[PDB]
């Protein structure tokens, strides 16, 4: 069953992250606020203890 089967050379000669297509993800403004605040808190987490 398909013992000898090959694929294009584009697959093996593509660069990294060439295939990613630009799609605009949409989310609610409440989601925007929630995620922005969460990311800001995570950035501001103080180092030393476990970070």
């Amino acid at each position: 069953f398909r013992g000898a089967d090959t694929y294009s050379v584009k697959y093996c000669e593509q660069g990294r992250y060439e295939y990613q297509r630009y799609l605009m993800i949409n989310r609610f403004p409440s989601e925007y606020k929630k995620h922005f605040l969460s990311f800001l808190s995570n950035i501001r987490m103080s180092s030393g203890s476990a970070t």
Partner: protein
């Protein structure tokens, strides 16, 4: 190798792929590959120059040649 009562067949193409007559660029790629290709390659040609030792020659060509 074969077993009893199984009537094995023959596979004509290695894989299912588009023929090279269907495009000008596939045709050119096949023509270039054929010109870069041998027609009958023997134990003396370049691809076997890595069998530099008689023991390498014998072990490659005697058994496990399928491998």
């Amino acid at each position: 190798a074969r077993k009893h009562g199984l009537f094995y067949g023959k596979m004509r193409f290695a894989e299912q792929k588009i023929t090279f007559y269907s495009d000008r660029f596939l045709f050119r790629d096949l023509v270039n590959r054929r010109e870069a290709s041998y027609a009958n390659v023997w134990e003396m040609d370049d691809p076997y120059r890595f069998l530099q030792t008689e023991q390498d020659y014998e072990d490659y060509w005697g058994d496990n040649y399928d491998v």
